[PDB]
Subunit: 228 residues, 3 copies
């Protein structure tokens, strides 16, 4: 339940808060329109994560879900976080490669399904069913990764070389980090429970900070965010 993992929740809260402040201050020295958008998007991501990590730390974002004949602690606040932060991260990537509206909607929509079905799975009372939702959510994730490689990368090359290289790195970072989430879910408290909640929380914290703060540091330090 909500106790051993408190340290990872506290560290997550602190790291997201610090990241938000760093991006906020760093963005003060920016007036370029396009550069503005990237800062706005990128700063909102850890700001949201900060509030949800704090909600979990304080116990608000935690609930008990019956399944497997047991009362299992489930941090639902994560999904509220991801619901808004994952599409924002996708928007950063899309804006970078100047994706068309159609592809953006496809990505945001698939992302919404990914998080929504993940939440349904996390709160499902029938054990076996939890994995059905996991599969559907994973399929949505694969769709997103597909678009990022066969509907994005190809266009990034048709853009400025500075944009292409920054997109390629952020793209690779996204694919590696995002793909780890379903694995942690599958092995953790929400899934088969091979890994305890304490360790599951630690894993998500490392992934979240990297996917948000790490991702943001790479993007906001790049010249790709400016139109030159």
């Amino acid at each position: 339940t909500g106790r051993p993992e408190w340290i990872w929740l506290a560290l997550g809260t602190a790291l997201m808060g610090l990241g938000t402040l760093y991006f906020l201050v760093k963005g003060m020295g920016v007036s370029d329109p396009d550069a503005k958008k990237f800062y706005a998007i990128t700063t909102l991501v850890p700001a949201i994560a900060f509030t949800m990590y704090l909600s979990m730390l304080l116990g608000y974002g935690l609930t008990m879900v019956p399944f497997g004949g047991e009362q299992n602690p489930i941090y639902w606040a994560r999904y509220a976080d991801w619901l808004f932060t994952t599409p924002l991260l996708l928007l950063d990537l899309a804006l970078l490669v100047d994706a068309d509206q159609g592809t953006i909607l496809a990505l945001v929509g698939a992302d919404g399904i990914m998080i929504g079905t993940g939440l349904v799975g996390a709160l499902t009372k029938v054990y076996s069913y939890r994995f059905v939702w996991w599969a559907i959510s994973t399929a949505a994730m694969l769709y997103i990764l597909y678009v990022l490689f066969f509907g994005f990368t190809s266009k990034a090359e048709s853009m400025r070389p500075e944009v292409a290289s920054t997109f390629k790195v952020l793209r690779n970072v996204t694919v590696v980090l995002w793909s780890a989430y379903p694995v942690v879910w599958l092995i953790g408290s929400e899934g088969a429970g091979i890994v305890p909640l304490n360790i599951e929380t630690l894993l998500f914290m490392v992934l979240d900070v990297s996917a948000k703060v790490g991702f943001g540091l790479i993007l906001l330090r790049s010249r790709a965010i400016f139109g030159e």
Copy 2:
């Protein structure tokens, strides 16, 4: 409760899933920007419906609401579905006639009110009050239908004849199908309960598949989605 109607929920799940896959594959042979948008929007609709129909089939999207001195089974997942799919359908229509941002916001906003108030009515514990919400939701629906005829049709004519004819058909399809929803709600388990949940579920399934898959088939088979 959740049993007799299982067959309609299973059929709905299957039909939405098949529709989503068909649109997904069909869209692979498309690269045109504007055509892209229509495929993205139209494929997301049954994809979302698929997840919610499955949630109902598995029992997750079902809840018990006290009213009329009874414990009434209410499938709340429908509203989560409609909250996102109805405005997407409206966006398809709006994009088709190249509606201005102002009208799109008006439609999306009215739609949000329609579904939101429908949900409030569906979960209201005071019988007579349920119909007050039904009336407000219906008023919002009438607003939407009004705009589609006196704020859309008139412009579709000012566009390409291919767009005008496809819009006219989809418009007519929308008006006929959407108008049936409040009637089913009024006579079904959420309303006066003249029709049993089993039959109510069947009716919504026929309406949903037609309004989503049927609607999509007409749109995506049209040349109106391309700019020529």
Copy 3:
């Protein structure tokens, strides 16, 4: 609990409904694209508020929250209202000064955090924690007010003098009214409880009608909404 304050909820419901109808009818005599957007945005605000005020009046938007060792009545419907109406009001201001996408996203995002954290605070079971959320929400509000003065006003001056003057008035109206909300929350039933729910409801009603209907009357009566 839900009784003495019924009159303020009924008055709020009536005033929001009347405002919505007035804006609806007033907007009929408009065909200008940009003017359209302002009417669509501005009419949706009181329309949404109307539904939520009615939900509170009927008892649906009310819930009991344990804290301070007591069962405290909390009208959660307010946050559902504000979640959608505050960013819409910000959009009116942003459209007026032709703000760039980056700033709009920053405002909408900060607003989402403001309302979200306010809701978390309103439903928190640990008394002292409620004020932590209040502080975070207030910080988000201050960010919004900052942008409206150092990221908006400066640009409004670079626009038509009619737009600048209307923005300045609406800006001032927004800053004064919005700043009162955290104070009412802090002194009312959601906070330290120095003011009874009855009076708290009255205060929010006066603020809401002014910030929505009053704000709208000023905007929609202005020539600033037209491009000339």
